Amino acid sequence: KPFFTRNPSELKGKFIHTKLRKSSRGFGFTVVGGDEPDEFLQIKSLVLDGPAALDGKMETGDVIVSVNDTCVLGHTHAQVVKIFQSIPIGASVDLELCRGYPLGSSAYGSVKAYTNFDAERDALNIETAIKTKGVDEVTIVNILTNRSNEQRQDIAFAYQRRTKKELASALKSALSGHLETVILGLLKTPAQYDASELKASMKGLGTDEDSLIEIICSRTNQELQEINRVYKEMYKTDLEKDIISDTSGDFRKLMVALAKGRRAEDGSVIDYELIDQDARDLYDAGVKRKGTDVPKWISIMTERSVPHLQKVFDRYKSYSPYDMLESIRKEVKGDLENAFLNLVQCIQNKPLYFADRLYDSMKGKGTRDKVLIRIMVSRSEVDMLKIRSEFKRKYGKSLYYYIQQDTKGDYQKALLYLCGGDD
Amino acid sequence: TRRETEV
Ligand SMILES: [Ca+2]
Ligand SMILES: [Ca+2]
Ligand SMILES: [Ca+2]
Ligand SMILES: [Ca+2]
């Protein structure tokens, strides 16, 4: 139940006022909202080379508070769009916008966008900490870990305007150890951070197969489509090329198929007949006959939608004495097995999958900091609340507790801020 | 899918 009100005095964000005159192609932005009884009308997007964007005051996620001295808090979608359309070309409109209530936010992340956001303020305070004799990592950790990734991008731009030096380079020189790894990962976008880890897993002639399997098997179509574009712009090489160069056999086929991000979107109606047939094919290709038909497994597990495959794996238990996970361990082995096991976990329960990976990175001597840092950074704005839920439900204690006992220093503080308290 | 209007 998102926040909503029709009295402007009860809003928490900041207020901005713009005055836009309509051009030939409108005001140059998209309005979203006004569906459910209490939906705020929010700025969906901007149109660059347009009246609203060239003004610069309007940004996405903004909430419309007043249109030409008439409050629209609570007005339906069709009412506020007829206002903008009744305006003639050349006439000016006065928009009051509130910045603080976000859009496109996952309700299951642990780190939320700062309500009283100020990019120039945080850029100044971080500069101070960098040049502080001793580096106030405390300040740097308190700021960046309590900002959203898009807010952190605005910190880097504001820091570059006032210092002419990129924040990633300045923080790479003043920090050290695992704390440097976490901060540099938080500064990158989700696509930039995943693309960098993928290249790192394929550096050298060897391959970190675990990091490659984790990212490829757990990312959706939209995330993979953005990673492929960013990876090609960063390293001048398509991700599929470096995957072929560092993988082979059926393992290569599976990773190439998954990395395409062309999995079928979830259909409106449930295909119960295809659910039964896909289960029969998975059983006839593996446990029933001797050997294994790996291509048939790759086709079904990569092309079908996630909700469909969930019902497929449940129907698979009707044909096979072993479930999908136990079938994988018996039929295939090696890198192909680890990739299939990771894929099925992400389909059945992805938050549970990241919980086990977190527990595996800390249960033994030392800490697999590479796996622990990547998960706490990439899933912080996605499903961290669900991972914490599945974690304490299974392991009794909280994820905050395990990070506490396996990490120390500011590196511990940074990861605890990304967790969001003990469950 | 979600009610959107080009303004
Ligand atoms: Ca360093
Ligand atoms: Ca067999
Ligand atoms: Ca440990
Ligand atoms: Ca370690």
Numbering used by the authors:
A (entry chain A): 456 to 878
B (entry chain C): 143 to 149
Quote from the publication.
The human proteome comprises 266 human PDZ (PSD95/DLG1/ZO1) domains 16 and about 4000 putative PBMs, defining a network of one million potential interactions. PBMs are mostly (though not exclusively) C-terminal, with their COO- implicated in binding, and are classified based on position −2, being respectively Ser/Thr, hydrophobic or acidic in classes 1, 2, and 3 17,18. PDZ-PBM interactions are rather transient and promiscuous. Viral proteins bearing functional PBMs are found notably in HPV and HTLV oncoviruses as well as in HBV, WNV and coronaviruses including MERS or SARS-CoV213,15,23–26.
The logos of PDZ domains SNTB1 and MAGI1_2 indicate preferences for x-R-E-T-x-V-COO- and R-x-E-T-x-V-COO-, respectively. The oncoviral PBM of HPV35 E6 satisfies both consensus requirements hence recognizes both PDZ domains. The structures of HPV35 E6 PBM bound to both SNTB1 and MAGI1_2 resolve their logo differences by revealing the distinctive contributions of Arg residues at p-4 and p-5 of HPV35 E6 in the two complexes. C MAGI1-2 PDZ logo matches with HPV35 E6 PBM at the same positions, but also at p-5 (Arg), exposed to the acidic β2-β3 loop of MAGI1_2 in the MAGI1/HPV35 E6 complex. Accordingly, HPV35 E6 binds stronger to MAGI1-2 than to SNTB1. Most PBMs in this oncoviral clade share the class 1 consensus E-[TS]-x-V-COO− (where x denotes for any residues), often immediately preceded by basic residue(s). These motifs showed generally high binding affinities with PDZ domains such as MAGI1_2, DLG1_2, SCRIB_1, SNTB1, or TX1BP3.
